[PDB]
Amino acid sequence: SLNPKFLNVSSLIQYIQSAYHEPLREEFKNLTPYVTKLSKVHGPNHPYLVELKETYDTFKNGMLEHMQKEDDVDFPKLIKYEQGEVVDDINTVIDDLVSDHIATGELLVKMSELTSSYEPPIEAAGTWRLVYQRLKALEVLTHEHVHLENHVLFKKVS
Amino acid sequence: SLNPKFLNVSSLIQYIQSAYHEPLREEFKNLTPYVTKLSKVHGPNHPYLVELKETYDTFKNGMLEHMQKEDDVDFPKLIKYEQGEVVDDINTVIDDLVSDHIATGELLVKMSELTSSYEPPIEAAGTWRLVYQRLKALEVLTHEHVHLENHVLFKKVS
Ligand SMILES: [Fe+3]
Ligand SMILES: [Fe+3]
Ligand SMILES: [Fe+3]
Ligand SMILES: [Fe+3]
Ligand SMILES: [O]
Ligand SMILES: [Zn+2]
């Protein structure tokens, strides 16, 4: 059980990528077909499952583009700033990054509302219950991720 | 709390250095005079105290040179190996580094045995109680330090 205090910016970014980015990206690939099946089968008579599908999709692609910007563009800046080099939009960067976290957040709220905190109705079975199950764990994984970035990584630079 | 398995060999090595190596060095600066003093004072009265001074000093000079071996020659050889460059001598390193861990190992046992189990007599006061506390302190940081290397960093490359 590491103390993050002792991880520098470059290594903490690494941990965030191995523990959160790469695990999230993979799950978004495995879950997505289940989430679309649930909406195609039981959406016809449960419309909220389609709102769930549509919301999950938006949260999903929101994450994936966001991470790409962090990995390929914005974490490199967070490093070179703490590596001394002049990065004059460091405050801009960090601001857009929380704008993104906030927004993905109120999206996770929406999914948690629609599912009633991921408790299936009894008349759910099979896919329906797995979808809820995995989303709940994804909601948890996403909160940890962003809390680590927000309250650890973004404070080492500012 | 953070999971060390997700760090790669180079991020983990940085962690070892900040969290363990640089602390241990700085503590050896601070604690060494007290050991010598407690040995000088109540050491005649009780000789096992000077057995302790000489045992601690051996474990000190040991750790110190062994961490410089890792910092200057062997944590490089491990990074360059994880990075894909051709490092033979790799298991020769991993095997000497545990040769030195197993060493500090049975040595820390003896310091602990010498000093009841870091239990100070009823005669002890001031100097004598600080040293035992700071040693049992130091004794546990080394367990963490050499358990991290042994079962994470070394099992990463192996
Ligand atoms: Fe991220
Ligand atoms: Fe993020
Ligand atoms: Fe070490
Ligand atoms: Fe070591
Ligand atoms: O993220
Ligand atoms: Zn797109």
Numbering used by the authors:
A (entry chain B), B (entry chain A): 67 to 224
List sentences quoted exactly from the publication behind this structure.
When first described, ScdA was placed in the so-called “repair of iron centres” (RIC) family and proposed to protect iron–sulfur enzymes that are damaged by ROS or RNS. We now show that the previously enigmatic di-iron enzyme ScdA functions as a nitrite reductase, converting nitrite to nitric oxide (NO), and we elucidate the structural elements that support this activity. Using an integrative toolkitX-ray crystallography, solution NMR, AlphaFold modeling, and pulsed EPR/DEERwe solved the full-length homodimeric structure of ScdA and identified a robust di-iron center that forms stable iron-nitrosyl intermediates. Our findings demonstrate that ScdA harbors a di-iron catalytic center, consistent with its placement in the RIC family.
We also analyzed a cysteine-free variant (C30A/C31A/C191A) by SEC. This CF variant produced a single peak at 10.9 mL, confirming that ScdA is a homodimer in the absence of intermolecular disulfide bonds. The crystal structure demonstrated that the CTD forms a homodimer, with each monomer encompassing a hemerythrin-like domain that binds nonheme iron. Based on the crystal structure, residues H87, H132, E136, H167, H211, and E215 were identified to coordinate the di-iron center. These residues are highly conserved among ScdA homologues. Additionally, the MV-based assay showed that mutating any one of the six di-iron-coordinating residues abolishes nitrite reduction, confirming their critical role as identified in the crystal structure. The dimer interface is located between two intermolecular α-helices (helix 5). From the X-ray result, we observed that residues near Ser77 (S77), particularly S77 and Gln80 (Q80), appear to form a hydrogen-bonding network that brings the two monomers into close proximity. Notably, the catalytic efficiency (k cat/K m) for CF ScdA is ∼2.4-fold higher than that of WT, indicating that the three native cysteines (C30, C31, C191) are not strictly required for nitrite reduction.
